[PDB]
Amino acid sequence: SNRRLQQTQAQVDEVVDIMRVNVDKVLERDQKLSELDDRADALQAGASQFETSAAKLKRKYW
Amino acid sequence: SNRRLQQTQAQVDEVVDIMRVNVDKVLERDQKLSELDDRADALQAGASQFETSAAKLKRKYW
Amino acid sequence: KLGKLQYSLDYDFQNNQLLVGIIQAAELPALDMGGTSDPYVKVFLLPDKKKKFETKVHRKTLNPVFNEQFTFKVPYSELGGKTLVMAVYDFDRFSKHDIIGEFKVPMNTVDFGHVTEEWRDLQSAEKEQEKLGDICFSLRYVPTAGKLTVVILEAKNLKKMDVGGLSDPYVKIHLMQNGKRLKKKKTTIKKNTLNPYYNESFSFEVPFEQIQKVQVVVTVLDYDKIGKNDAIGKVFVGYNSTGAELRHWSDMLANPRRPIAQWHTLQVEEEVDAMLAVK
Amino acid sequence: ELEEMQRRADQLADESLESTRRMLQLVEESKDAGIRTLVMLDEQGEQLDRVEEGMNHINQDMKEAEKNLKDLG
Amino acid sequence: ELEEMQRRADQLADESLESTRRMLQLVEESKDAGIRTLVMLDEQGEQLDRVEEGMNHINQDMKEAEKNLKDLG
Amino acid sequence: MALSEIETRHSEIIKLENSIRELHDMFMDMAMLVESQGEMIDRIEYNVEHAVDYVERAVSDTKKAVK
Amino acid sequence: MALSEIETRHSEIIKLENSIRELHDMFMDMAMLVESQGEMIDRIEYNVEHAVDYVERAVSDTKKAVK
Amino acid sequence: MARENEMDENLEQVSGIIGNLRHMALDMGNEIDTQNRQIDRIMEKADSNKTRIDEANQRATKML
Amino acid sequence: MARENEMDENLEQVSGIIGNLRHMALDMGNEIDTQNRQIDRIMEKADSNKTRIDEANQRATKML
Ligand SMILES: [Mg+2]
Ligand SMILES: [Mg+2]
């Protein structure tokens, strides 16, 4: 019964076509996550600086 | 309804997979036909030669 | 301890048939009144239990001599993946004939070409768990919001429930406390499958102050339209749980804001419900 | 020629068989890899949610800080 | 942004539509090409049959010629 | 839906059109090859019929020669 | 059937095995990437929580400073 | 929705035509195979007669 | 035929597992998309707060 063989083959091909797209989307996710990582590091750096300045200002105007 | 789109797509893919194999088999047919052509030319050549010899032999033993 | 068994084995390539000879047995334990049992040996091909051969019943001897022969019309190609079973039975006129011993011989260890004949020690026949099915799911609990996320992933090697085919499994989840069934959930019904895949998430409202007093009951059942729907297996995690279940629970607790997936072995509903009626 | 042919056929049969067994093993590995992938997706998802709540909190706090600095100036 | 977005959507709709029309045309050409292909296959098939009958006739004739040459020798 | 759904729809549709086009080209090549091979068969049958004639005449001649 | 049928059967089966294998490798790569990205998210959330702490303390200080 | 439905009809027709194309491709390929077997037969017979006529011609010219 | 059937069973199991793999791939991809949208949101908010905190820090150090 070649019908089942070829049908299963078509299933496999379909799932492959799904998975490669999924993989590319995952790569895009890796890019976005990397940039978010850099942005977060910069964010916490600025946060610490602003915290220090806030300490100075509290020790000034109170 | 993506189901019909993807289903039709699967149909197209299947028919493609049929047709490429058919095409290769056709190429094989082209090979076989070419060789048969050469063989036929040689065959009719030998046929004419044998016809001539047969004419001589008839004009000899009768 | 029952005794030993002398038997003969060889293959006739001229007729393509297996020649199994039962010679005798020795030092068999006595189970009958007179101080001696009434033994008889049942021999059959190990692969398929069809057309089993039985010897004549010998009266009151712990060293019976049968010297009988049996023929198994089996090709030589199929023979290699076929085993032989020789079990010694005790005859009793007014009750079930108790099995004295048994012996299994793999046909891939057997060497044909020379006529084989040996003594082998008898062993006690096997009476393991019947279900042999497993269910895998993930547990996630974050203490702050009190959310319990039970994601039914997938079951495998489930017991057949339908006649001459696979089963129609579906997962029912109960949440119990002090013997009472609070919440009721279920999944989609996957039809005709040996290994059902669901990947379905469920959420429950469980406070942090009662986390050590809750029961999570996962049940895999079979679905027929007509009549009562039977049950394949069930396992429970949480309060009064033991084994890998309590382990998975403790992993859920030790790892908050994170889901831990694990497999679990299906138990009979009687024992489980008996455990849930505790305290 | 004939014996070698029959043996060839049975050979191809066995080869295809063990091939299918290899397929079963491969789709099993694929299956499990997929499952653990989904698990990772759930975990990282909840982590992303916590990140979002973090961002919201930061926004509100800095809004208040902006208010105080505008009240000081 | 919004107007351009709606217009973009309708645009994609039209594009997909005319695309499907192109598909219909293409599968029509394919259809006809296939038909005439089959016709050619029938014709060439009958020609091959005539070729086979030719070969058979040649074989029998040369068998007779072989007989005469063996009767002459 | 949204623009994502429409975009993916459009993409898969274009994919379908390209697959269809490949199918088409395959059919065209098919018809072509079959035709050329048809001409080849023409000349084959020609040579064969000529051969048949020659063989027939030869056989007649030898058959009259032996007796 | 014949040897041709068995051979084509075997061929298509091997083709299936290779497609299956590619699918497998795709799943493996999937799990891998998702894991590494998971670690990336770990350090992101770390930096974010630190940032939150710093911002909170800063806001407290300014809030006490203005009044 | 008219835009969408119109397209839907198109896709349905394309589906039917594709099915017919499948059937045609099957018949095509099958007959191609059978004709290939026949061609093999033809070349076998043609080589046979080639040998026949070569040997016969040699034997015929031998008696000259 | 036992050789052939055994193989048949194998192919059926492979078929089922492949179907499940399809479903899993769909869920996977979808959730990946949604999480990507969420990440986009996160980077928008994070850039917003980055600007907020830079401007706020400058204004704060201005009064020093
Ligand atoms: Mg007794
Ligand atoms: Mg049922």
Curated annotation (Swiss-Prot), chains A, B:
Alphabetized GO MF terms: calcium-dependent protein binding; calmodulin binding; identical protein binding; lipid binding; molecular adaptor activity; myosin binding; phospholipid binding; protein-containing complex binding
PTM section of the record: Phosphorylated by PRKCZ in vitro and this phosphorylation is increased in the presence of WDFY2.
Intracellular or extracellular location(s): Cytoplasmic vesicle, Secretory vesicle, Synaptic vesicle membrane; Cell membrane
Superkingdom in the source lineage: Eukaryota
GO terms classed as biological process: calcium-ion regulated exocytosis; cellular response to insulin stimulus; eosinophil degranulation; establishment of localization in cell; exocytic insertion of neurotransmitter receptor to postsynaptic membrane; Golgi to plasma membrane protein transport; hormone secretion; long-term synaptic potentiation
Keywords (A to Z) from UniProt: Acetylation, Cell membrane, Coiled coil, Cytoplasmic vesicle, Membrane, Phosphoprotein, Synapse, Transmembrane, Transmembrane helix
Domain v-SNARE coiled-coil homology: residue ranges: 4-62
Record's keyword annotation contains Transmembrane helix: yes
Record has Cell membrane as a keyword: yes
Site ((Microbial infection) Cleavage): residue numbering on this chain: Q31, K32, L33, R39, A40, Q49, F50, A54, A55
Membrane topology: Single-pass type IV membrane protein
Segments in the Cytoplasmic topological domain: 1-62
Annotated Gene Ontology cellular component terms: clathrin-coated vesicle; cytoplasm; cytoplasmic vesicle; cytoplasmic vesicle membrane; glutamatergic synapse; membrane; neuron projection terminus; perinuclear region of cytoplasm
Tissue distribution: Nervous system specific. A higher level expression is seen in the brain as compared to the spinal cord. Expressed in hippocampal neurons.
Organism encoding this protein: Rattus norvegicus
Curated annotation (Swiss-Prot), chain C:
Domain C2, chain residue ranges per copy: 1-120, 131-264
Compartmental location: Cytoplasmic vesicle, Secretory vesicle membrane; Cytoplasmic vesicle, Secretory vesicle, Synaptic vesicle membrane; Cytoplasmic vesicle, Secretory vesicle, Chromaffin granule membrane; Cytoplasm
GO cellular component, one term: synaptic vesicle
GO aspect biological process, one term: vesicle organization
Record keyword Iron present: no
Assembly mode: Homotetramer. Heterodimer; heterodimerizes with SYT2 in presence of calcium. Interacts with SCAMP5. Interacts with STON2. Forms a complex with SV2B, syntaxin 1 and SNAP25. Interacts with SV2A, SV2B and SV2C. Interacts with RIMS1. Interacts with PRRT2. Interacts with DNAJC5 in a phosphorylation-dependent manner. Interacts (via N-terminus) with RAB3A. Interacts with SYT12. Interacts with calmodulin. Interacts with DNM1 (via C-terminal proline-rich domain (PRD)); this interaction facilitates vesicle fission during clathrin-mediated endocytosis (CME). (Microbial infection) Interacts with C.botulinum neurotoxin type B (BoNT/B, botB). Has lower affinity for BoNT/B than Syt2; mutating its residues to match those in Syt2 increases its affinity.
Family label: Belongs to the synaptotagmin family.
Protein name: Synaptotagmin-1
Species whose genome carries this gene: Rattus norvegicus
Encoding gene, per UniProt annotation: Syt1
From Swiss-Prot, chains F, G:
Site label (Microbial infection) Cleavage, positions: K64, A65
Taxonomy, superkingdom: Eukaryota
Crosslink site: Glycyl lysine isopeptide (Lys-Gly) (interchain with G-Cter in SUMO): K63, K64, K67
Cystine pairs: none
Posttranslational modification: Phosphorylated by CK2. (Microbial infection) Targeted and hydrolyzed by C.botulinum neurotoxin type C (BoNT/C), which hydrolyzes the 253-Lys-|-Ala-254 bond. Cleavage inhibits neurotransmitter release.
Cellular localization per UniProt: Cytoplasmic vesicle, Secretory vesicle, Synaptic vesicle membrane; Cell membrane; Synapse, Synaptosome
Tissue/organ expression: Expressed predominantly in cerebral cortex, hippocampus, cerebellum, adrenal medulla and retina with weak expression detected in non-neuronal tissues.
Limits of the t-SNARE coiled-coil homology domain: 3-65
Quaternary state and interactors: Part of the SNARE core complex containing SNAP25, VAMP2 and STX1A; this complex constitutes the basic catalytic machinery of the complex neurotransmitter release apparatus. The SNARE complex interacts with CPLX1. Interacts with STXBP1. The interaction with STXBP1 promotes assembly of the SNARE complex. Interacts (via C-terminus) with KCNB1 (via C-terminus); the interaction increases in a calcium-dependent manner and induces a pore-independent enhancement of exocytosis in neuroendocrine cells, chromaffin cells, pancreatic beta cells and from the soma of dorsal root ganglia (DRG) neurons.
Family indicated by similarity: Belongs to the syntaxin family.
Name this protein carries in UniProt: Syntaxin-1A
Organism: Rattus norvegicus (Rat)
From Swiss-Prot, chains H, I:
Lineage top rank: taxon: Eukaryota
Assembly description: Part of the SNARE core complex containing SNAP25, VAMP2 and STX1A;this complex constitutes the basic catalytic machinery of the complex neurotransmitter release apparatus. Recruited to the SNARE complex following binding of the SNARE complex component STX1A to STXBP1. This complex binds CPLX1. Found in a complex containing SYT1, SV2B and syntaxin-1. Found in a ternary complex with STX1A and VAMP8. Interacts with HSC70 and with SYT9, forming a complex with DNAJC5. The interaction with SYT9 is inhibited in presence of calcium. Isoform 1 and isoform 2 interact with BLOC1S6. Interacts with CENPF.
Gene responsible for this protein: Snap25
UniProt similarity note: Belongs to the SNAP-25 family.
Residue ranges constituting the t-SNARE coiled-coil homology domain according to the UniProt record: 2-63
Function per UniProt: t-SNARE involved in the molecular regulation of neurotransmitter release. May play an important role in the synaptic function of specific neuronal systems. Associates with proteins involved in vesicle docking and membrane fusion. Regulates plasma membrane recycling through its interaction with CENPF. Modulates the gating characteristics of the delayed rectifier voltage-dependent potassium channel KCNB1 in pancreatic beta cells.
Compartments (UniProt record): Cytoplasm, Perinuclear region; Cell membrane; Synapse, Synaptosome; Photoreceptor inner segment
PTM annotation, UniProt: Palmitoylated.
Ranges annotated as spanning the membrane: none
Name under which the protein is recorded: Synaptosomal-associated protein 25
Record-annotated site: (Microbial infection) Cleavage: R41, I42, Q58, R59
Coiled coil: none
